[model samples]
Target: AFCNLRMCQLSCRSLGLLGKCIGDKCECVKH
Candidate 1:
């Protein structure tokens, strides 16, 4: 397990980016 729930969402949430779990990694995209 290389990805945690907050490990992705928390990071993305504070950055004004969208967070999603894609495959086995954290996906972050800013628009």
Candidate 2:
């Protein structure tokens, strides 16, 4: 199997962005 580092970085960055947005806003995050 082969792994793509760029994709991994992108996924990590996207998750970080989502985490920042939803960190304390449960109500906005529920929907």
Candidate 3:
């Protein structure tokens, strides 16, 4: 799950420190 989150962030082009760019993700256990 941890690695998945990091991958998610990397896949994103604009991920914020607070994970705002991918906020909707990881919240509900996405990916």
Winner by TM-score: 1
**Alpha-carbon runs more than 4 Å astray in model 1:** 1-6
Greater lDDT among 1 and 3 belongs to 1
Candidate 2 local lDDT, 1-31, one digit each (tens): 2344455445556655321222333211111
For 1-31, candidate 3 gives per-residue lDDT tens digits of: 2336655555552444322243455422233
Comparing 1 and 2 on TM-score, the stronger one: 1
Better candidate number, 1 or 3, judged by TM-score = 1
- State how far residue 10 of model 1 sits from its true place (Å): 1.5
Error of 3 at 18 (Å): 8.0
lDDT of 1 by residue, 1-31 (tens): 6577677887898888877767788988885
Ranked by TM-score from best down, the candidates are 1, 2, 3
Candidate 2 TM-score to native:
0.38
User: How high a TM-score does candidate 1 get?
Assistant: 0.47
Clashes of each: 0, 0, 0
Off by over 4 Å in 3: 1-3, 14-31
Sorting all predicted structures by lDDT, with the top scorer first, yields 1, 3, 2
Query: How much is the lDDT of residue 24 in candidate 2?
Result: 34
